[PDB]
Amino acid sequence: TKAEKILARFNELPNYDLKAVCTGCFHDGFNEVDIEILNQLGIKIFDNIKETDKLNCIFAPKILRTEKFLKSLSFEPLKFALKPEFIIDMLKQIHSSQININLFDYEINGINESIISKTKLPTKVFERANIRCINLVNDIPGGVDTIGSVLKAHGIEKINVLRSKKCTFEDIIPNDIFKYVLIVTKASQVKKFTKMINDRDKNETILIVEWNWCVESIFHLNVDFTSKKNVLYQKK
Amino acid sequence: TKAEKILARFNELPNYDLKAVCTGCFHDGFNEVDIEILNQLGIKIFDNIKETDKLNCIFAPKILRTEKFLKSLSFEPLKFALKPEFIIDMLKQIHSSQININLFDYEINGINESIISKTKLPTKVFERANIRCINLVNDIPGGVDTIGSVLKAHGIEKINVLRSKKCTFEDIIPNDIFKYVLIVTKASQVKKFTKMINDRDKNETILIVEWNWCVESIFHLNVDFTSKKNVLYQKK
């Protein structure tokens, strides 16, 4: 309606083909007209992530530890990671002919071409890393449900949640290299799991890490097993 | 079949999803079984470029000035530019567990990933440059046929072929910002077309360049109007 009018002034409207979510921006959302204008430029911003929407883009001010940002690094592929100013400056321009904006002026820092291009690979970061099944303490910040959803988007097949305190060796699943992989928060957890596994499956390989180990692996789309950062314990 | 036999030895074969052409390589072609193998890896190598095959990949030993290479820069997008060894090494492994090969070990030397990502844009390079209709001399090496279709793949709408030397102003087309854009071969052509356009359409803008001006624009997926390299004459 009012949008057709605004856009009618334009001749060669680009189709950007962006199927995006946003994080840490656009907190006011968009009015009906801006959504229609965007649609015309082939831009849609989805409120939630759905596999069927074939998302290929994230808007964010910077690298953020959010569920959406982390998952965006599992898009197939991730086409662009852009600052919200791209949308803001484009709309302001249209609201005043032709659109001249350089999409490449708005790339998020630290999300470089080498990383983005890893999303074109046939594998996910944890599949490449041979971490198929993982154990996750249930006391983990953010809630076990969101952590697991992120880890599964990034190639982990089985997320086993361990009851804090209550658990025994039988509750632990192996990884089908490290036979046992655990994500913990407390150093008393590290000792408890080391004892338990050496008692019940002695001489088996173990990797115990904290959440930041995964997060950093995602941010780089590579697990560097030679690194000692965020590794709490390992037996190989 | 026999390829299945060969690959059945493998669990979790990758799906590279490559729709490729090759240039400067695979000159012996592939046998029936290697093609079925590649097929199972999600790799197909087409003999020619067809818009509807939605190609996303080129195999080449290095950056080449072939029609196939130049056009691969107009893929939507170009996902990988890879050395032929990628295919050779992997088929070698296969004919002899699983496939252990790193796609990124085979990136073509001297390709800028930031350049390849411009293929993700909604526009082509000459469309961005507002070079829509050009004039091309007929003695241009490689022939007008191939130069013409390379330019069209990269956003130029009309290619007007000029007969030198029996040539008049009426044989020239304007670019519908430079009103007249000419690709020439010889210094005497530069002088001729300047004289002619100034006489018949005085005080109009003119850009006269060498073929290499277009080739380098394509290699960088950018026409840099600030550079004078490969420019023979301009009046702005």
Short mmCIF file of C-alpha atoms in Angstrom, two decimals:
data_model
loop_
_atom_site.label_atom_id
_atom_site.label_comp_id
_atom_site.label_asym_id
_atom_site.label_seq_id
_atom_site.Cartn_x
_atom_site.Cartn_y
_atom_site.Cartn_z
CA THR A 1 0.00 0.00 0.00
CA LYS A 2 1.93 3.00 1.33
CA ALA A 3 4.93 0.76 0.57
CA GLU A 4 4.08 0.29 -3.13
CA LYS A 5 3.99 4.06 -3.40
CA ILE A 6 7.39 4.54 -1.74
CA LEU A 7 8.94 1.78 -3.83
CA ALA A 8 7.30 2.88 -7.10
CA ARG A 9 9.84 5.72 -7.14
CA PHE A 10 12.53 3.05 -7.59
CA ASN A 11 13.60 1.34 -10.82
CA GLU A 12 16.07 -1.50 -10.37
CA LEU A 13 15.34 -2.93 -6.94
CA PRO A 14 17.86 -5.64 -5.96
CA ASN A 15 16.83 -9.02 -4.55
CA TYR A 16 19.31 -9.57 -1.74
CA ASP A 17 17.90 -13.03 -0.89
CA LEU A 18 18.53 -12.66 2.85
CA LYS A 19 16.73 -15.07 5.15
CA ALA A 20 17.87 -13.69 8.45
CA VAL A 21 17.50 -13.63 12.20
CA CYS A 22 18.80 -10.85 14.42
CA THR A 23 20.38 -10.75 17.82
CA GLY A 24 21.19 -7.79 20.03
CA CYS A 25 19.45 -5.36 17.65
CA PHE A 26 16.11 -4.32 16.10
CA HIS A 27 14.64 -4.61 19.58
CA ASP A 28 11.82 -2.27 18.49
CA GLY A 29 11.09 -4.55 15.53
CA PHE A 30 9.76 -3.09 12.29
CA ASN A 31 6.51 -1.42 11.25
CA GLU A 32 4.25 -2.94 8.58
CA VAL A 33 5.66 -0.72 5.83
CA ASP A 34 9.33 -1.47 6.54
CA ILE A 35 8.61 -5.19 6.55
CA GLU A 36 6.95 -4.83 3.14
CA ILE A 37 9.77 -2.71 1.72
CA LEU A 38 12.31 -5.30 2.98
CA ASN A 39 10.28 -8.11 1.45
CA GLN A 40 10.52 -6.30 -1.88
CA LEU A 41 14.31 -6.20 -1.60
CA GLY A 42 14.12 -9.95 -0.87
CA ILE A 43 14.93 -9.49 2.81
CA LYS A 44 13.03 -11.27 5.57
CA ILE A 45 13.85 -11.23 9.27
CA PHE A 46 12.49 -14.28 11.07
CA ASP A 47 11.64 -14.11 14.82
CA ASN A 48 12.85 -17.67 15.36
CA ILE A 49 15.18 -20.21 13.77
CA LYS A 50 13.51 -23.00 11.76
CA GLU A 51 15.43 -25.49 9.65
CA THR A 52 12.86 -25.25 6.86
CA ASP A 53 13.36 -21.49 6.48
CA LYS A 54 16.88 -22.14 5.11
CA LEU A 55 18.27 -19.11 6.95
CA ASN A 56 21.48 -17.66 5.50
CA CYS A 57 22.05 -14.39 7.37
CA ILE A 58 22.43 -12.89 10.84
CA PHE A 59 22.11 -9.26 11.94
CA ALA A 60 24.06 -8.30 15.04
CA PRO A 61 26.18 -5.38 16.35
CA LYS A 62 29.06 -7.73 17.10
CA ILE A 63 29.88 -11.32 17.95
CA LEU A 64 27.50 -12.35 20.71
CA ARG A 65 27.17 -15.46 22.85
CA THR A 66 23.44 -15.78 22.11
CA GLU A 67 21.61 -18.87 20.87
CA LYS A 68 20.84 -17.17 17.58
CA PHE A 69 24.41 -16.02 16.96
CA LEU A 70 25.85 -19.41 17.79
CA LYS A 71 23.37 -21.20 15.59
CA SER A 72 23.85 -18.83 12.72
CA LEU A 73 27.31 -20.27 12.45
CA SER A 74 25.62 -23.58 11.53
CA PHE A 75 23.58 -22.12 8.60
CA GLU A 76 24.00 -23.96 5.27
CA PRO A 77 25.65 -21.80 4.34
CA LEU A 78 25.94 -18.58 6.27
CA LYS A 79 25.91 -16.06 3.42
CA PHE A 80 26.36 -12.83 5.43
CA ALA A 81 26.87 -11.71 9.00
CA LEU A 82 25.88 -8.04 8.97
CA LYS A 83 25.55 -5.13 11.38
CA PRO A 84 21.97 -3.80 11.81
CA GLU A 85 23.05 -0.47 10.28
CA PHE A 86 22.83 -2.14 6.90
CA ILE A 87 19.08 -2.35 7.27
CA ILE A 88 18.82 0.97 9.12
CA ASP A 89 20.73 2.94 6.50
CA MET A 90 18.93 1.25 3.64
CA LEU A 91 15.49 2.06 5.02
CA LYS A 92 16.44 5.65 5.83
CA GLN A 93 17.67 5.95 2.26
CA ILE A 94 14.47 4.56 0.77
CA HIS A 95 12.32 6.81 2.96
CA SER A 96 14.52 9.48 1.33
CA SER A 97 15.47 7.02 -7.76
CA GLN A 98 17.93 4.25 -6.90
CA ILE A 99 19.32 2.39 -3.89
CA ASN A 100 23.05 2.71 -3.41
CA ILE A 101 24.43 0.98 -0.35
CA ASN A 102 27.47 -1.27 -0.11
CA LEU A 103 26.53 -4.44 1.74
CA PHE A 104 30.23 -5.14 2.26
CA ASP A 105 30.51 -1.95 4.33
CA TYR A 106 28.52 -3.66 7.09
CA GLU A 107 30.21 -6.99 7.85
CA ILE A 108 30.51 -7.92 11.52
CA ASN A 109 34.05 -7.86 12.91
CA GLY A 110 35.74 -11.20 13.64
CA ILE A 111 33.38 -13.06 11.35
CA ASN A 112 35.80 -13.19 8.47
CA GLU A 113 35.70 -14.98 5.13
CA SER A 114 37.73 -17.94 6.31
CA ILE A 115 35.20 -18.61 9.04
CA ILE A 116 32.05 -17.93 7.04
CA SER A 117 33.36 -20.21 4.29
CA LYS A 118 33.63 -23.12 6.72
CA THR A 119 29.84 -23.14 6.69
CA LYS A 120 30.05 -24.32 3.06
CA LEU A 121 31.80 -27.53 4.20
CA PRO A 122 29.98 -30.89 4.04
CA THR A 123 30.46 -31.30 7.86
CA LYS A 124 29.69 -29.41 11.11
CA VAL A 125 32.46 -28.37 13.48
CA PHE A 126 31.87 -31.16 16.03
CA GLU A 127 31.44 -33.79 13.30
CA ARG A 128 34.84 -32.85 11.93
CA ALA A 129 36.14 -32.99 15.46
CA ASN A 130 34.73 -36.50 16.06
CA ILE A 131 32.74 -35.43 19.08
CA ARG A 132 29.55 -37.30 18.46
CA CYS A 133 28.20 -37.90 21.92
CA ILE A 134 28.76 -35.62 24.90
CA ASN A 135 27.84 -35.48 28.60
CA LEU A 136 26.54 -32.24 30.00
CA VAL A 137 26.07 -31.44 33.69
CA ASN A 138 22.53 -30.24 34.29
CA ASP A 139 23.67 -27.29 36.39
CA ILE A 140 25.05 -25.56 33.30
CA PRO A 141 24.18 -21.82 32.87
CA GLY A 142 21.62 -20.98 30.19
CA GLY A 143 19.79 -24.24 30.72
CA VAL A 144 20.66 -27.67 29.39
CA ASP A 145 17.93 -27.31 26.74
CA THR A 146 19.52 -24.40 24.92
CA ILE A 147 23.07 -25.63 25.19
CA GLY A 148 22.07 -28.94 23.69
CA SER A 149 20.16 -27.33 20.87
CA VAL A 150 23.24 -25.30 19.97
CA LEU A 151 25.51 -28.37 20.22
CA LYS A 152 23.21 -30.44 18.00
CA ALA A 153 23.01 -27.72 15.35
CA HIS A 154 26.81 -27.96 15.37
CA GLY A 155 26.99 -31.67 14.73
CA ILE A 156 26.74 -33.39 18.09
CA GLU A 157 24.47 -36.43 17.80
CA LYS A 158 23.72 -37.24 21.43
CA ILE A 159 23.56 -34.84 24.38
CA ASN A 160 23.50 -36.75 27.66
CA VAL A 161 22.44 -34.67 30.66
CA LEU A 162 23.89 -35.78 33.99
CA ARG A 163 21.98 -35.27 37.23
CA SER A 164 24.25 -33.28 39.56
CA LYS A 165 25.28 -35.48 42.51
CA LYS A 166 22.68 -38.20 41.86
CA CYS A 167 24.44 -39.65 38.79
CA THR A 168 26.56 -42.79 38.46
CA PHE A 169 28.82 -44.28 35.80
CA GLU A 170 25.86 -46.05 34.18
CA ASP A 171 24.38 -42.62 33.35
CA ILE A 172 27.42 -41.61 31.29
CA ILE A 173 27.54 -42.26 27.58
CA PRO A 174 30.62 -42.80 25.53
CA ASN A 175 31.72 -41.08 22.41
CA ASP A 176 31.60 -43.51 19.55
CA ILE A 177 39.82 -40.01 20.01
CA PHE A 178 38.13 -39.56 23.36
CA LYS A 179 35.77 -42.18 24.70
CA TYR A 180 34.30 -39.86 27.30
CA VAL A 181 33.59 -36.20 26.74
CA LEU A 182 32.10 -34.08 29.48
CA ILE A 183 31.21 -30.42 29.80
CA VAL A 184 31.39 -29.23 33.41
CA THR A 185 31.34 -26.00 35.43
CA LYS A 186 32.96 -26.89 38.78
CA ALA A 187 36.40 -28.32 39.59
CA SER A 188 34.79 -30.70 42.09
CA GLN A 189 32.90 -32.06 39.11
CA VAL A 190 36.21 -32.67 37.34
CA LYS A 191 37.54 -34.71 40.24
CA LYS A 192 34.28 -36.64 40.70
CA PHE A 193 34.11 -37.67 37.02
CA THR A 194 37.80 -38.53 36.79
CA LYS A 195 37.48 -40.86 39.80
CA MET A 196 34.27 -42.44 38.58
CA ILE A 197 35.55 -43.23 35.09
CA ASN A 198 38.99 -44.49 36.16
CA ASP A 199 37.23 -46.74 38.68
CA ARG A 200 34.61 -48.11 36.29
CA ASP A 201 36.39 -47.89 32.91
CA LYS A 202 40.07 -47.58 33.74
CA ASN A 203 42.60 -46.85 31.00
CA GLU A 204 39.92 -45.20 28.84
CA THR A 205 40.36 -41.77 27.26
CA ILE A 206 38.67 -38.74 28.76
CA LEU A 207 38.08 -35.11 27.80
CA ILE A 208 36.57 -32.68 30.27
CA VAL A 209 36.00 -29.10 29.20
CA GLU A 210 33.95 -26.08 30.13
CA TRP A 211 31.32 -24.36 28.00
CA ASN A 212 33.72 -21.72 26.63
CA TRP A 213 35.63 -24.53 24.94
CA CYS A 214 32.58 -25.25 22.79
CA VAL A 215 31.71 -21.60 22.30
CA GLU A 216 35.19 -20.80 21.07
CA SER A 217 35.16 -23.87 18.82
CA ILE A 218 31.94 -22.57 17.30
CA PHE A 219 33.22 -18.99 16.86
CA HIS A 220 36.13 -20.42 14.89
CA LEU A 221 34.27 -23.36 13.37
CA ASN A 222 37.21 -25.56 14.32
CA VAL A 223 38.08 -27.73 17.30
CA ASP A 224 41.78 -27.34 18.03
CA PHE A 225 42.55 -30.40 20.19
CA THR A 226 46.14 -29.24 20.60
CA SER A 227 44.96 -26.22 22.57
CA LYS A 228 44.87 -26.37 26.39
CA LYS A 229 42.53 -23.39 26.81
CA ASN A 230 39.26 -24.27 28.62
CA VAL A 231 40.36 -27.92 28.85
CA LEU A 232 39.90 -28.92 32.51
CA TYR A 233 41.18 -32.46 32.16
CA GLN A 234 42.22 -34.86 29.45
CA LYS A 235 43.60 -38.39 29.25
CA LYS A 236 44.82 -39.66 25.90
CA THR B 1 27.38 -50.73 -8.98
CA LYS B 2 31.12 -51.39 -9.24
CA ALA B 3 31.46 -47.92 -7.75
CA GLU B 4 29.09 -48.96 -4.95
CA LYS B 5 31.32 -51.98 -4.43
CA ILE B 6 34.31 -49.65 -4.18
CA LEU B 7 32.59 -47.18 -1.85
CA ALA B 8 30.70 -49.68 0.32
CA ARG B 9 34.02 -49.86 2.16
CA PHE B 10 33.05 -46.39 3.41
CA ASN B 11 30.71 -45.12 6.09
CA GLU B 12 29.59 -41.48 6.17
CA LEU B 13 30.86 -40.36 2.76
CA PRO B 14 30.70 -36.56 2.52
CA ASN B 15 28.30 -34.73 0.22
CA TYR B 16 30.32 -31.83 -1.24
CA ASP B 17 27.45 -30.57 -3.41
CA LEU B 18 29.72 -29.29 -6.19
CA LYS B 19 28.39 -28.44 -9.62
CA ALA B 20 31.62 -27.64 -11.36
CA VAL B 21 33.30 -26.94 -14.66
CA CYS B 22 37.04 -27.24 -15.18
CA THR B 23 39.56 -25.30 -17.20
CA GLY B 24 43.22 -26.06 -17.79
CA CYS B 25 42.86 -29.52 -16.26
CA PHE B 26 41.26 -32.99 -16.45
CA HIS B 27 42.22 -32.95 -20.10
CA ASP B 28 42.04 -36.77 -20.18
CA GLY B 29 38.44 -36.72 -18.87
CA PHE B 30 37.17 -39.34 -16.41
CA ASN B 31 36.19 -42.98 -16.82
CA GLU B 32 32.68 -44.30 -16.11
CA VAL B 33 33.49 -45.49 -12.59
CA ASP B 34 35.23 -42.30 -11.40
CA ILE B 35 32.21 -40.29 -12.50
CA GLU B 36 29.88 -42.55 -10.50
CA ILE B 37 32.20 -42.22 -7.51
CA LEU B 38 32.20 -38.41 -7.74
CA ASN B 39 28.43 -38.56 -8.19
CA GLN B 40 28.14 -40.37 -4.86
CA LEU B 41 30.28 -37.67 -3.21
CA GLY B 42 27.89 -35.03 -4.53
CA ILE B 43 30.33 -33.89 -7.20
CA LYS B 44 29.47 -33.34 -10.86
CA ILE B 45 31.70 -31.84 -13.55
CA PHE B 46 29.76 -30.41 -16.47
CA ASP B 47 31.40 -30.05 -19.91
CA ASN B 48 29.85 -26.66 -20.59
CA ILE B 49 28.29 -23.73 -18.73
CA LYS B 50 24.50 -23.68 -18.62
CA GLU B 51 22.69 -21.10 -16.52
CA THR B 52 20.11 -23.60 -15.28
CA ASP B 53 22.71 -26.13 -14.03
CA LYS B 54 23.31 -23.58 -11.22
CA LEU B 55 27.08 -24.16 -11.20
CA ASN B 56 28.90 -23.26 -8.00
CA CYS B 57 32.46 -24.47 -8.54
CA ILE B 58 35.46 -24.27 -10.82
CA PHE B 59 38.44 -26.59 -11.04
CA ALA B 60 41.63 -24.96 -12.27
CA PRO B 61 45.40 -25.13 -11.56
CA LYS B 62 45.55 -21.36 -11.17
CA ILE B 63 43.79 -18.18 -12.21
CA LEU B 64 43.38 -18.45 -16.01
CA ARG B 65 42.07 -16.13 -18.69
CA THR B 66 39.78 -18.74 -20.17
CA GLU B 67 36.10 -18.23 -20.94
CA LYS B 68 35.24 -20.87 -18.33
CA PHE B 69 37.26 -19.19 -15.62
CA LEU B 70 35.98 -15.67 -16.38
CA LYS B 71 32.40 -16.93 -16.39
CA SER B 72 32.87 -18.95 -13.19
CA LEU B 73 33.17 -15.50 -11.55
CA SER B 74 29.55 -14.91 -12.50
CA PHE B 75 28.22 -18.04 -10.70
CA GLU B 76 25.50 -17.34 -8.11
CA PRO B 77 27.39 -17.80 -6.02
CA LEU B 78 30.79 -19.26 -6.80
CA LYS B 79 31.16 -21.53 -3.76
CA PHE B 80 34.64 -23.00 -4.35
CA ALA B 81 37.54 -22.37 -6.68
CA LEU B 82 39.67 -25.51 -6.30
CA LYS B 83 42.79 -27.14 -7.70
CA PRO B 84 42.29 -30.36 -9.73
CA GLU B 85 44.40 -32.23 -7.15
CA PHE B 86 41.33 -32.18 -4.90
CA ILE B 87 39.63 -34.64 -7.23
CA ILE B 88 42.84 -36.55 -8.13
CA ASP B 89 43.87 -37.08 -4.50
CA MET B 90 40.46 -38.12 -3.31
CA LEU B 91 39.89 -40.63 -6.11
CA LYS B 92 43.37 -41.93 -5.33
CA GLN B 93 42.50 -42.45 -1.67
CA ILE B 94 39.25 -44.07 -2.66
CA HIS B 95 40.78 -46.56 -5.03
CA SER B 96 43.05 -46.88 -2.10
CA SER B 97 38.10 -46.37 6.89
CA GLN B 98 36.88 -43.11 5.39
CA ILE B 99 37.82 -40.20 3.14
CA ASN B 100 40.36 -37.90 4.74
CA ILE B 101 40.82 -34.80 2.63
CA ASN B 102 40.65 -31.12 3.49
CA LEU B 103 38.85 -29.03 0.88
CA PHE B 104 40.67 -25.88 2.05
CA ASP B 105 44.07 -27.45 1.32
CA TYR B 106 43.16 -27.07 -2.35
CA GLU B 107 42.09 -23.44 -2.79
CA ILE B 108 43.41 -21.94 -6.01
CA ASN B 109 46.45 -19.80 -5.37
CA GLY B 110 45.98 -16.06 -5.44
CA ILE B 111 42.20 -16.06 -5.16
CA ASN B 112 40.88 -13.56 -2.66
CA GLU B 113 37.98 -15.00 -0.66
CA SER B 114 36.63 -11.46 -0.38
CA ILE B 115 36.53 -11.44 -4.19
CA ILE B 116 34.65 -14.73 -4.46
CA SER B 117 32.12 -13.51 -1.89
CA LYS B 118 31.09 -10.67 -4.26
CA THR B 119 29.39 -13.41 -6.27
CA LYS B 120 26.88 -13.39 -3.37
CA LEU B 121 25.76 -9.88 -4.35
CA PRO B 122 22.41 -9.21 -6.06
CA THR B 123 24.26 -7.56 -8.98
CA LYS B 124 26.94 -8.38 -11.59
CA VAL B 125 30.14 -6.36 -11.80
CA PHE B 126 29.30 -4.28 -14.92
CA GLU B 127 25.78 -3.71 -13.66
CA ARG B 128 27.29 -2.21 -10.51
CA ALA B 129 29.56 -0.11 -12.71
CA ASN B 130 26.64 1.12 -14.83
CA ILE B 131 28.31 -0.21 -17.98
CA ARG B 132 25.22 -1.46 -19.82
CA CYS B 133 25.98 -1.08 -23.55
CA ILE B 134 29.45 -1.28 -25.05
CA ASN B 135 31.15 -1.05 -28.41
CA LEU B 136 33.71 -3.66 -29.31
CA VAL B 137 36.09 -3.64 -32.27
CA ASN B 138 35.96 -6.70 -34.51
CA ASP B 139 39.70 -7.44 -34.55
CA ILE B 140 39.63 -8.06 -30.80
CA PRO B 141 41.67 -11.24 -30.10
CA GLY B 142 39.66 -14.28 -29.07
CA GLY B 143 36.86 -13.10 -31.35
CA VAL B 144 33.77 -11.05 -30.58
CA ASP B 145 31.69 -14.19 -29.89
CA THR B 146 33.45 -15.23 -26.69
CA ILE B 147 34.25 -11.75 -25.43
CA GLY B 148 30.60 -10.95 -25.98
CA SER B 149 29.22 -13.80 -23.87
CA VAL B 150 31.79 -13.32 -21.12
CA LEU B 151 30.73 -9.65 -20.87
CA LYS B 152 27.05 -10.56 -20.89
CA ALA B 153 27.49 -13.09 -18.05
CA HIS B 154 28.99 -10.17 -16.13
CA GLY B 155 26.07 -7.79 -16.60
CA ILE B 156 26.57 -6.03 -19.93
CA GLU B 157 23.30 -5.93 -21.90
CA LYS B 158 24.34 -4.98 -25.42
CA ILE B 159 27.56 -5.71 -27.24
CA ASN B 160 27.87 -3.66 -30.42
CA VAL B 161 30.56 -4.93 -32.79
CA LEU B 162 32.28 -2.20 -34.81
CA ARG B 163 33.86 -2.74 -38.20
CA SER B 164 37.07 -0.74 -38.47
CA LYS B 165 38.00 0.98 -40.52
CA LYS B 166 34.92 1.53 -42.69
CA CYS B 167 33.06 2.89 -39.70
CA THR B 168 30.83 5.89 -39.02
CA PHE B 169 29.39 7.52 -35.89
CA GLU B 170 26.06 5.89 -36.73
CA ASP B 171 27.57 2.43 -36.13
CA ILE B 172 28.19 3.36 -32.49
CA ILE B 173 25.79 2.80 -29.63
CA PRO B 174 25.50 4.84 -26.47
CA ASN B 175 25.53 3.43 -22.97
CA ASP B 176 21.97 3.87 -21.86
CA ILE B 177 28.51 8.07 -16.24
CA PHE B 178 29.93 7.49 -19.68
CA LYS B 179 27.72 7.82 -22.65
CA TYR B 180 30.14 6.05 -24.94
CA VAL B 181 32.10 2.97 -23.92
CA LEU B 182 34.50 1.37 -26.38
CA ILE B 183 36.84 -1.61 -26.17
CA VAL B 184 39.61 -1.25 -28.74
CA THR B 185 42.80 -2.96 -29.85
CA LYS B 186 45.06 -0.29 -31.37
CA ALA B 187 46.24 3.24 -30.59
CA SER B 188 44.91 4.44 -33.96
CA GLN B 189 41.44 3.30 -32.95
CA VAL B 190 41.66 5.46 -29.81
CA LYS B 191 42.40 8.57 -31.91
CA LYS B 192 39.72 7.66 -34.49
CA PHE B 193 36.83 7.18 -32.06
CA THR B 194 37.71 10.25 -30.02
CA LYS B 195 37.76 12.40 -33.15
CA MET B 196 34.53 10.87 -34.37
CA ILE B 197 32.53 11.21 -31.14
CA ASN B 198 33.80 14.73 -30.39
CA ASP B 199 32.81 15.76 -33.94
CA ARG B 200 29.33 14.18 -33.91
CA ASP B 201 28.38 14.28 -30.21
CA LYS B 202 30.57 17.03 -28.81
CA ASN B 203 30.94 17.45 -25.05
CA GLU B 204 29.56 13.97 -24.32
CA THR B 205 31.42 11.59 -21.99
CA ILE B 206 33.59 8.83 -23.37
CA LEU B 207 35.49 5.84 -22.04
CA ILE B 208 37.85 3.86 -24.20
CA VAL B 209 39.61 0.85 -22.75
CA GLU B 210 41.59 -2.28 -23.58
CA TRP B 211 40.17 -5.79 -23.24
CA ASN B 212 42.41 -6.21 -20.20
CA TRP B 213 40.39 -3.48 -18.44
CA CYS B 214 37.39 -5.82 -18.49
CA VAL B 215 39.45 -8.88 -17.55
CA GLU B 216 40.89 -7.23 -14.47
CA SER B 217 37.44 -5.87 -13.52
CA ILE B 218 36.20 -9.43 -13.63
CA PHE B 219 39.15 -10.83 -11.65
CA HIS B 220 38.36 -8.34 -8.89
CA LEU B 221 34.61 -8.34 -9.43
CA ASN B 222 34.92 -4.55 -9.28
CA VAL B 223 35.30 -1.79 -11.84
CA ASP B 224 37.47 0.80 -10.15
CA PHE B 225 36.78 4.07 -11.98
CA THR B 226 39.55 5.80 -10.02
CA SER B 227 42.22 3.64 -11.67
CA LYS B 228 43.66 4.61 -15.07
CA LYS B 229 45.18 1.16 -15.65
CA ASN B 230 44.05 -0.29 -19.02
CA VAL B 231 42.21 2.96 -19.76
CA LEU B 232 43.23 4.49 -23.11
CA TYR B 233 41.02 7.55 -23.03
CA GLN B 234 38.29 9.03 -20.91
CA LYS B 235 36.35 12.28 -20.87
CA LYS B 236 34.18 12.81 -17.79
#
